[PDB]
Ligand binder design. Structure first.
Ligand code: FAD
Ligand code: CL
Length: 221
């Protein structure tokens, strides 16, 4: 307990409904905030009609006094977020958490995202406009209407040729599968999506390419 730490006080400045069920929150904080792309944080909302309990969400962009989250409806709080959350509202955050720093991974990196699991990588893309690493990125989503940030990703491919982008619509091709997929020899694979999808892909990637490093963060929708 050798540090006195105060929560990060914030105001919500902008919101955008990216699709039918996912909403992007832009926050201004009272003082600069440390994180590294791939970490999450615990957000507490103070608006009439909202529970103020802390929910974790992956940080999906920002530096300094700007922080972004992208929320997919999955239950009542998130549904309330999509529907009713309002610019002006006060929020606090404790601090960054997680062991998924994309910076610290190898030169070579494979990225796998299922659904709203793309958020941590949007973080990376947003804060590294020119890309240093070598990236194969697999974005899996259930139907075009569950994809987000498409334009941002395509713009990023155009600016960064060392950025290689695969869009899988799982309803077209079936769940992503890495059995007959090879992996760069000295690569780090990062993954984020439904827990069910993580565990299945971990299995497939530790067996085919058992020499690969693999960091993931699951959740349930
Ligand atoms: C590290 C991490 C990062 C994350 N990042 C993100 C992110 O970037 N974006 C994002 O949208 N989410 C993210 N999540 C998930 C998010 O934290 C939760 O999904 C969210 O806080 C749930 O809030 P809720 O009240 O809407 O869900 P709840 O209503 O609490 O329920 C959650 C789930 O449980 C089920 N459920 C609800 N009520 C009941 C009941 N009475 N009985 C049985 N089952 C029930 C629902 O089907 C629902 O899907 C992350 C989670 C983790 C752990
Ligand atoms: Cl799951």
């Amino acid at each position: 307990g050798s540090k006195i730490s105060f929560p990060y006080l914030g105001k919500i400045t902008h919101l955008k409904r990216l699709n039918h069920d996912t909403r992007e929150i832009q926050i201004h904080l009272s003082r600069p905030f440390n994180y590294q792309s791939g970490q999450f944080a615990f957000l507490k909302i103070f608006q009439e009609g909202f529970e103020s309990a802390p929910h974790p969400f992956s940080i999906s962009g920002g530096h300094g006094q700007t922080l972004y989250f992208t929320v997919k409806t999955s239950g009542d709080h998130t549904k309330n977020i999509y529907d009713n959350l309002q610019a002006g509202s006060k929020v606090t955050l404790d601090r960054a958490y997680g062991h998924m720093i994309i910076e610290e991974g190898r030169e070579n990196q494979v990225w796998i995202a299922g659904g709203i699991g793309i958020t941590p990588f949007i973080s990376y893309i947003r804060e590294h406009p020119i890309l240093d690493k070598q990236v194969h990125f697999y974005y899996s989503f259930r139907g075009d209407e569950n994809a987000v940030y498409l334009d941002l990703l395509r713009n990023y491919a155009q600016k960064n040729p060392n950025f290689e982008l695969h869009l899988i619509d799982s309803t077209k091709d079936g769940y992503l599968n890495f059995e007959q997929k090879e992996v760069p020899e000295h690569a780090t694979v990062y993954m984020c999506g439904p827990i069910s999808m993580m565990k299945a892909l971990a299995k497939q990637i530790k067996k085919q390419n058992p020499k690969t490093e693999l960091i993931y963060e699951g959740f349930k929708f």
